[PDB]
């Protein structure tokens, strides 16, 4: 992975040694080049994973997440450079440095072979993320959002640290390849119940599981755009990726320990989907949409079937691009009217025709129109949960109806109807904004032509 | 906010339109329109206003019982089949300020005349504000009515968004 | 219950301005100043060539040399055979049915 770690590190001297007026041009260009080289991780085999060294390996799960991570960095620089224009040069470079350091931690997190190494990098991503929200967030409540984000994570991740160290004492290793062969079944006992909870709760809080999700709508409403993009696109998936790995060593206890969390997710997705119908803040609505989509991923991971694991992987990639798009679309309205209230600016299709097309395409992927990878992932999960229990189709089906209602409600309210009379500063869409939208949707829709590369190891 | 006279005349217009919806045929509607007008005429000169109010209240109860469940609606009236149909084509005039210079270059005459209107609006605004100040009682306006211009060369206060509103068929 | 004299005056003044504004929406003669059966068959001839002949060449080439070179990609329902038919592949003759009872 050094071929990706080192050029990612080199982005920092590049940004600090650039001409004052070329920091965005240089950092954007070269992080796109890094993104290009990340397609070499597609050398995946039918049986064995791509095992680079003692520290890092890649397989069909981490590879799509790695490519999404490295693609998002140039998109985040594009999205941020406008609202940061007044910021002084040194603080602009510090912002870019936090984004670069976040990518470095993420690519190491997704390829770490040893689980304790994964833990440290999994935890390291908090620091830059918290700095981005609290330092460059706009409103007073970013400080509270920083605290809720920090302490929800640590409340769960500290027990995970104890469990992981305990496993290494008992098994002798935390290398994931070793655990694949030395895994022993988890017997029933109260000690093992709490070992299971310690191994899972940290990832649940990040997903987030319904009931532990209240930190996420806060974080989004306060974060700058780049913070929201990385939060929705990648940082939520640290939980899913972690769960997909650690469930290896929790069998067969997961058979019954998953029940409370399947109930929370199955009922949670309908609650959060219903909540979206009444949200008044556009960022908050998109945030609640994420909780509903990720509730599907939790269920898929917990029932552990080949179809559910393939659907979970596709959903994680598909949601990453869609939710990042939706935040970017909402932000482009914010940069004009400086309010997140959904009902403030209406009938924008009359004033911004092409931006309304991006709004339509994003909404259609959010409601999972076939054959988008959003639908492929959701469908594979629905198929597998039907076998788990036929009654789940009723809950899955109801959520599909509610998802369409709130996705189109968001499109109708902001883009259709009559424009607001007094809002007279809706200037035409910039080339930057249009390019940013298309750099989300185009790879998303292109993936429909070759979905296998985002279906994960079980493919 | 409605006087007794306004309430009676609104019911007369409303009752005739529902009658026309029941009758359909013009000769039939003419016949019953005269019968209905006679009913309003018998109590035209009622003086005991308590009786007049009771007549109005009973008439409204009669209208509610006998209203058409699907009355005719003019196509562009609220609830009609063409209501708000052309709102998607109505674009506010401030949008022309964001046109690229090459777009403006296609209509040199239109935009020269547009600048004259913007100049007229700019030079009129201070006097419009002052007129409203000196004509408004201390505690602010008590009604939504606005006054005319008083001198020559003045424009009626707050005229721009009325005069420059989108055309009803803008495309 | 008609206009007050002040209402009448305001409407008259706005009416003068509105009509002037609407007149100013008319395009001048030069606007927009813009920057720099034999036919019927030919129109339909070029369309048939580019929208039927070229696509069918591509589809036929694709079906003949890529799709039908793989098993079971195009599967036909086997032709119906009736009593008295002759087979091209073998030359086999299918015998007729029995003699029908009169009806």
């Amino acid at each position: 992975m050094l071929k990706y770690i080192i050029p990612t590190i080199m982005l920092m001297p590049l940004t600090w040694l650039s001409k004052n007026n070329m920091i965005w041009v240089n950092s954007t260009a070269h992080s796109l080049l890094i993104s290009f080289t990340s397609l070499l991780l597609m050398n995946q085999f039918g049986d064995n994973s791509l095992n680079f060294s003692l520290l890092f390996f890649s397989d069909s799960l981490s590879t799509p997440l790695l490519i999404l991570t490295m693609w998002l960095l140039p998109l985040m620089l594009m999205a941020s450079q406008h609202h940061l224009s007044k910021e002084n040069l040194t603080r602009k470079k510090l912002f870019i440095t936090m984004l670069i350091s976040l990518q470095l931690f993420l690519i190491m997190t997704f390829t770490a072979m040893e689980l304790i190494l994964f833990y440290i990098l999994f935890e390291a991503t908090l620091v830059p993320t918290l700095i981005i929200i609290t330092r460059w967030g706009n409103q007073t409540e970013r400080l509270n959002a920083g605290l809720y984000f920090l302490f929800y994570t640590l409340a769960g991740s500290l027990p995970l640290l104890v469990a992981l160290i305990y496993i290494q004492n008992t098994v002798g290793s935390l290398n994931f390849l070793m655990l694949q062969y030395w895994v022993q079944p988890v017997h029933n006992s109260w000690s093992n119940v709490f070992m299971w909870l310690a191994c899972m709760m940290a990832f649940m809080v990040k997903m987030p599981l319904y009931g532990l999700h209240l930190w996420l709508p806060k974080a989004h409403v306060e974060a700058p755009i780049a913070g929201s993009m990385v939060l929705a696109a990648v940082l939520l998936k640290l939980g899913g990726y972690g769960m997909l790995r650690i469930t290896l060593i929790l069998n067969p206890m997961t058979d019954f320990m998953a029940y409370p969390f399947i109930m929370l997710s199955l009922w949670g997705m309908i609650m959060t989907s219903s909540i979206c119908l009444r949200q008044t803040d556009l960022k908050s609505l998109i945030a609640y949409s994420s909780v509903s989509h990720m509730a599907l991923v939790i269920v898929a991971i917990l029932i552990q079937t080949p179809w559910s694991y393939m659907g979970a992987t596709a959903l994680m990639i598909a949601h990453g691009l869609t939710s990042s798009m939706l935040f970017c679309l909402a932000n482009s309205n914010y940069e004009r009217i400086h309010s997140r209230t959904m009902i403030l600016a209406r009938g924008l299709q009359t004033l911004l025709p092409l931006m309304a097309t991006w709004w339509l395409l994003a909404s259609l992927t959010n409601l999972a129109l076939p054959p988008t990878i959003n639908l492929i992932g959701e469908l594979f999960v629905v198929m597998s949960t039907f076998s788990w229990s036929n009654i789940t189709i009723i809950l899955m089906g109801v959520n599909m109806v509610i998802t369409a209602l709130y996705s189109l409600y968001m499109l109708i309210m902001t883009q259709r109807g009559k424009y607001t009379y007094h809002i007279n500063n809706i200037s035409p869409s910039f080339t930057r904004e249009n390019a940013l939208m298309s750099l989300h949707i185009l790879p998303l829709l292109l993936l429909t032509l070759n979905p296998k590369i985002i279906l994960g190891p079980l493919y | 906010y409605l006087t007794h006279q306004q309430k009676v005349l609104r019911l007369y217009k409303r009752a005739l339109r529902h009658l026309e919806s029941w009758c359909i045929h013009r000769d039939k509607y003419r016949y019953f329109a005269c019968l209905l007008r006679a009913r309003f005429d018998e109590h035209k000169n009622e003086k005991d206003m308590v009786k007049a109010t009771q007549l109005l209240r009973e008439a409204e109860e009669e209208f509610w019982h006998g209203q058409h469940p699907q009355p005719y609606i003019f196509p562009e009236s609220p609830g009609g089949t063409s209501y708000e149909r052309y709102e998607c084509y109505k674009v506010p005039e401030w949008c022309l300020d964001d046109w690229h210079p090459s777009e403006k270059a296609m209509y040199p005459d239109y935009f020269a005349k547009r600048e004259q209107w913007k100049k007229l609006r700019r030079e009129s605004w201070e006097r419009e504000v002052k007129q409203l100040q000196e004509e408004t009682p201390v505690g602010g306006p008590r009604t939504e009515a606005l006054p005319p211009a008083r001198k020559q060369g003045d424009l009626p206060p707050l005229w721009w968004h009325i005069v420059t509103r989108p055309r009803e068929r803008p495309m | 219950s008609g206009y007050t004299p002040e209402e009448k005056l305001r409407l008259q003044q706005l009416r003068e301005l509105r009509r002037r504004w609407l007149k100013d929406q008319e395009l001048s003669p030069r606007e927009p100043v813009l920057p720099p059966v034999i036919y019927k068959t030919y129109r339909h001839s070029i369309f048939a060539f580019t929208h039927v002949l070229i696509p069918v060449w591509i589809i036929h080439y694709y079906l003949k040399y890529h799709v039908t070179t793989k098993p079971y990609t195009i599967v036909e329902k086997k032709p119906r055979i009736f009593p008295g038919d002759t087979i091209l592949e073998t030359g086999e003759v299918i015998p007729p049915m029995k003699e029908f009872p009169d009806q």
Partner: peptide, 12 residues
């Protein structure tokens, strides 16, 4: 006659 059609800028 022909009347000017007010549209948002289509150039960008």
């Amino acid at each position: 006659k022909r009347l000017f059609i007010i549209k948002p800028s289509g150039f960008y």
